[PDB]
A and B are shown apart, each in its own frame.
Chain A
Amino acid sequence: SIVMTQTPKFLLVPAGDRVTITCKASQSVNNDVTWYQQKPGQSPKLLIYYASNRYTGVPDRFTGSGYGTDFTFTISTVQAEDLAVYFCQQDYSSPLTFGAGTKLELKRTVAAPSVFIFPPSDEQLKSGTASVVCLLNNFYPREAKVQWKVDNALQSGNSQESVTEQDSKDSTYSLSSTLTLSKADYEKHKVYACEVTHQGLSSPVTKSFNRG
């Protein structure tokens, strides 16, 4: 099949910057190139067709160009809402094939997380397990270190975390970490703490509670 080679794989720019993405077809595909945008949690949307035509309703900051093998897609001034994977498609001949995508990331100013801790609910405690949740909200950049401590003892192997995609309005991330203990173990300790290290903080922030 025809291979579409899309570069770069990732772009990181502040709002207002221009970007150009490239797709190179492995053979001539004339003008049979389409560009789509896929925002987090949404299906792809059509932006450009026949290489250079904007689809109805698409903002004029989006353009495309090319004929033959070398195709580009340009955002003249990137906006926060443009956080998305952009991908090209050829339909010169079957099968339709797609580039591997370019993830457009928004650079914004450093923002320290707001840190919140949640004890297990009494509802969960009835069931025999205890989940403690630490939330790091609306921070930038994405890198962050979360350490769980129970009665000042560092925990390992009993927590999991995940991070949202960048927010489409403020360009921040959030992170949720869950410490999972048996109810019996939870009820043998007092102080539950999550300690957060992040480039927006001058020293680590610890949020804690005393069981009971």
Chain B
Amino acid sequence: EVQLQQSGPELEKPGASVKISCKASGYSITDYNMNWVKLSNGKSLEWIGNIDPSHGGTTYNQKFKGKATLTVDKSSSTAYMQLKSLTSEDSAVYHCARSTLYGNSAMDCWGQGTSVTVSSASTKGPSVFPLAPSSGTAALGCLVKDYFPEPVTVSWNSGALTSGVHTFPAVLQSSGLYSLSSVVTVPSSSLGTQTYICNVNHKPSNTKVDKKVEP
């Protein structure tokens, strides 16, 4: 029942700052250390530092001194990491993860990650277009076109449909905008009797679209 719930994805301009949250539930945050780690696309994981949530002491990787500040709000069971003076080198997915307060730093429970994109480009929400099935398995999907920054989420039928789903990595177009597709294969017999709706969320632009994909 232990969960670490991180704040959502963020677009930030170079030179700005961002404060990422990590809310603990199912345990008391003060009983364990909290760690923060960074993963940049095509690089190795890096440990930023830790914080003792009970009394507030911190250890930083020297590479992140002056870049990251770790705090905790005990009253709300929430750990925070502020990233300052942002540059494109800070674009990454950041996780919080707990480990023992007085012992080893094996990180046994991780947050879901927070994507930060540092860019001067403006946010743009996607258009969502059906990939309609046509002429005993059928394929159908949704095209999630022209958004910035990453990420988006796609589910099918509010999460009730998972088997046979493939949501592809986004591609970056020359316009500077991403596009991705999500497809599913289903029994051809179901096309006239089962509803298929893709649920698309692009949090940075506050875009939520449900699109029915009709045969």
Alpha-carbon gap, A43 to B108, bound state (A): 11
| Residue pair A160, B173 in contact (C-beta under 8 Å) | yes
Count how many chain A residues have C-beta atoms less than 8 Å from C-beta atoms of the other chain: 45
> Which residue of B110, B134, B139 is within 8 Å of A43 (Cβ)?
B110
B residues near A99, Cβ cutoff 8 Å = 44
A20 interfacial by beta-carbon distance below 8 Å: no
| Residue pair A124, B129 in contact (C-beta under 8 Å) | yes
| Residue pair B185, A137 in contact (C-beta under 8 Å) | yes
B141 interfacial by beta-carbon distance below 8 Å: yes
What's the minimum C-beta distance from B166 to chain A, rounded to whole angstroms? 5
What's the minimum C-beta distance from A206 to chain B, rounded to whole angstroms? 15
Question: Contact flags (1/0) for B166-202 with A, using CB distance below 8 Å?
Answer: 1111110100000111010100000000000000000
Judged by DSSP, the binding face of A is strand
A72-100 with Cβ < 8 A to chain B: 87, 89, 91, 94-100
Number of A-B contacts (CB under 8 A): 120
Question: Contact flags (1/0) for B35-70 with A, using CB distance below 8 Å?
Answer: 100000000111101000000000101110000000
| Residue pair B104, A49 in contact (C-beta under 8 Å) | yes
B residues near A121, Cβ cutoff 8 Å = 129-132, 143
By a beta-carbon cutoff of 8 Å, the part of chain A in contact with chain B is 1, 32, 34, 36, 43-46, 49-50, 55, 87, 89, 91, 94-101, 114, 116, 118, 120-121, 123-124, 127, 131, 133, 135, 137-138, 160-164, 167, 174, 176, 178, 180
| Residue pair A32, B139 in contact (C-beta under 8 Å) | no
Alpha-carbon gap, A101 to B39, bound state (A): 12
Alpha-carbon gap, A45 to B44, bound state (A): 16
Alpha-carbon gap, A160 to B168, bound state (A): 12
By a beta-carbon cutoff of 8 Å, the part of chain B in contact with chain A is 35, 44-47, 49, 59, 61-63, 95, 97, 104-108, 110-113, 127, 129-132, 134, 137, 139, 141, 143, 145, 166-171, 173, 179-181, 183, 185
- Interface centre among B107, B137, B145, by most chain A C-beta atoms within 10 angstroms, is B107
A residues near B127, Cβ cutoff 8 Å = 124, 127
A residues near B111, Cβ cutoff 8 Å = 43
